[PDB]
Amino acid sequence: NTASLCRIGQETVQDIVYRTMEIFQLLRNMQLPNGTYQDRLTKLQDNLRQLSVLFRKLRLVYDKCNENCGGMDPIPVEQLIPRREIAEVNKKLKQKNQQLKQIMDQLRNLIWDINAMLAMRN
Amino acid sequence: EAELSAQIRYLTQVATGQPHEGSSYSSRKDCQMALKRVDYARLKLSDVARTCEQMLE
């Protein structure tokens, strides 16, 4: 779950940035009643809460990832390069996908057909 | 005699010449076409259900 930690933290940073984006967005829309709307303040608060959540989350994931679980890491250079169960799940997935595509094709044909008719005389 | 004579007089009033060039075959053709449309739709739907059932195993 280590690489899982890496990816999830990565996504948490995007979540940070996007939350900040929407927070400033909500702030921009604000009105200062002239009204008694007050729902604005509600969204602002409960929005600001998630940011607080994600920061502690980032601290936790950072700690767990730089924990360095017995790793004598080589510097990136020389990494740029100038299990059967995976195969089984991949095969099952590809089969299920193919069946889904038969279904999608059938529905496409039905929709083309129903369209042809009705649009012809309805 | 009286009743039949009255009926004949009325029938003269209606005067019933050549046949009525009236027909409801147009709306009938259209409605049969609509029924055929819904039949085709239901058929193809039964088919796609069968397919998704198979895939859903």
UniProtKB/Swiss-Prot annotation, chain A:
Which UniProt keyword terms apply here? Acetylation, Activator, Coiled coil, Nucleus, Transcription, Transcription regulation
Instruction: Tell me if Thylakoid is a UniProt keyword of this record.
Output: no
Keyword flag Transcription: yes
Instruction: Name the principal localization, coarsely classed.
Output: nucleus
Instruction: Let me know which tissues express this protein, per UniProt.
Output: Expressed in brain, heart, kidney, liver, lung, pancreas, placenta and skeletal muscle.
GO MF assignments: nuclear thyroid hormone receptor binding; nuclear vitamin D receptor binding; transcription coactivator activity; transcription coregulator activity; ubiquitin protein ligase activity
What is a biological process (GO) this protein takes part in? positive regulation of DNA-templated transcription
For this record, the Gene Ontology CC terms, alphabetical, are: core mediator complex; mediator complex; nucleoplasm; nucleus; ubiquitin ligase complex
Q: Which family does it belong to?
A: Belongs to the Mediator complex subunit 30 family.
Q: How does it assemble?
A: Component of the Mediator complex, which is composed of MED1, MED4, MED6, MED7, MED8, MED9, MED10, MED11, MED12, MED13, MED13L, MED14, MED15, MED16, MED17, MED18, MED19, MED20, MED21, MED22, MED23, MED24, MED25, MED26, MED27, MED29, MED30, MED31, CCNC, CDK8 and CDC2L6/CDK11. The MED12, MED13, CCNC and CDK8 subunits form a distinct module termed the CDK8 module. Mediator containing the CDK8 module is less active than Mediator lacking this module in supporting transcriptional activation.
**What function does the entry list?**
Component of the Mediator complex, a coactivator involved in the regulated transcription of nearly all RNA polymerase II-dependent genes. Mediator functions as a bridge to convey information from gene-specific regulatory proteins to the basal RNA polymerase II transcription machinery. Mediator is recruited to promoters by direct interactions with regulatory proteins and serves as a scaffold for the assembly of a functional preinitiation complex with RNA polymerase II and the general transcription factors.
Protein name (Swiss-Prot/TrEMBL): Mediator of RNA polymerase II transcription subunit 30
Tell me which species this is from: Homo sapiens (Human)
**Taxonomic classification:** Eukaryota, Metazoa, Chordata, Craniata, Vertebrata
- What gene makes this protein? MED30
**Whole-protein coverage range:** 29 to 178 of 178
Swiss-Prot record, chain B:
Top-level taxon of the source organism? Eukaryota
Localization (cell): Nucleus
Assembly with partners or alone: Component of the Mediator complex, which is composed of MED1, MED4, MED6, MED7, MED8, MED9, MED10, MED11, MED12, MED13, MED13L, MED14, MED15, MED16, MED17, MED18, MED19, MED20, MED21, MED22, MED23, MED24, MED25, MED26, MED27, MED29, MED30, MED31, CCNC, CDK8 and CDC2L6/CDK11. The MED12, MED13, CCNC and CDK8 subunits form a distinct module termed the CDK8 module. Mediator containing the CDK8 module is less active than Mediator lacking this module in supporting transcriptional activation.
Q: What family is it from?
A: Belongs to the Mediator complex subunit 11 family.
Q: Which disease is it linked to?
A: Neurodegeneration with developmental delay, early respiratory failure, myoclonic seizures, and brain abnormalities: An autosomal recessive disorder characterized by congenital microcephaly, profound global developmental delay, exaggerated startle response, refractory myoclonic seizures, progressive widespread neurodegeneration, and premature death.
Q: What job does the chain carry out? A: Component of the Mediator complex, a coactivator involved in the regulated transcription of nearly all RNA polymerase II-dependent genes. Mediator functions as a bridge to convey information from gene-specific regulatory proteins to the basal RNA polymerase II transcription machinery. Mediator is recruited to promoters by direct interactions with regulatory proteins and serves as a scaffold for theee assembly of a functional pre-initiation complex with RNA polymerase II and the general transcription factors.
Its name, as the record gives it, is Mediator of RNA polymerase II transcription subunit 11
Q: Which organism is it from?
A: Homo sapiens (Human)
Instruction: State which gene encodes it.
Output: MED11
Q: Where in the full protein does the shown chain start and end, and how long is the full protein?
A: 60 to 116 of 117
